[PDB]
Chain A
């Protein structure tokens, strides 16, 4: 009895994983526009916070390469809402 039910459960998991796979292309597209929208907002504000600093190139990279580098949590959520950040960083780990 235990083996048939377990075997049935492996097939259910595949049907669950495939449904995820059919959706990932849409979620990837949404995630891209969401990050780029937030990187610009951080860039736009920095222009108004470092408008007077003499030795400052706005939006300058820190890497020598021009490749795309995925932004870390500090960059992406630079000055977002305090509770927005907390759920962005510890939202999953603390959700029980």
Chain B
């Protein structure tokens, strides 16, 4: 149904993580982290945060593009592997799927699964707020606050990024 869009997207979210966690060739591993990046952007979006959802998807699209260019250089062999071409990758891929299937089965039937934490299967929609906000996006206001409120966060983040450039220039210089 439609009331369970977030739960369905989260199931697909886990399936992508089982995807690249099996560690096929990073070409397919990068594909899995892009699929989960997209649906992960959907889940956040359905909770109200559209800027956050688009940001993570956008940032991971760029990052996984650099990984692709590196895979053809440092992480490639004559016969790249798929989820079917190894027993280790196949055994791990089917393992994670069954463990997700049994969680979806018990939560949707029992309505209460306790594994470390207690989880409730009534439906994600039961916790949403009822009232409306004002004439603005609440999450947008908070992200804008980074500059008026987060002065200390900007300074460290800006400094860390600047050193990040310097650091990789030293590491990769070689000789």
Contact = CB atoms under 8 A, between A and B. Distances in A.
- A–B interface present (Cβ within 8 A): yes
Chain B interface SS verdict (over half): loop
Interface residues of A, number: 17
A93 B135 contact: no
Contacts of B129: 70, 72-73
Contacts, number: 42
B48 A82 contact: no
A89 B128 contact: yes
A17 B130 CA distance: 23
B35 interface: no
Interface string A67-96: 000111110100000100110111001000
A90 B127 contact: no
Interface residues of B, number: 17
Contacts of B135: 17, 20
Contacts of B2: 86, 90
B46 A74 contact: no
Chain A interface SS verdict (over half): helix
Given A20-B135, A31-B131, A74 B48 contact: no
Interface of B: 1-3, 5, 45-46, 48, 122-123, 125-131, 135
5 contacts: A35-B130, A73-B126, A73-B127, A86-B3, A90-B125
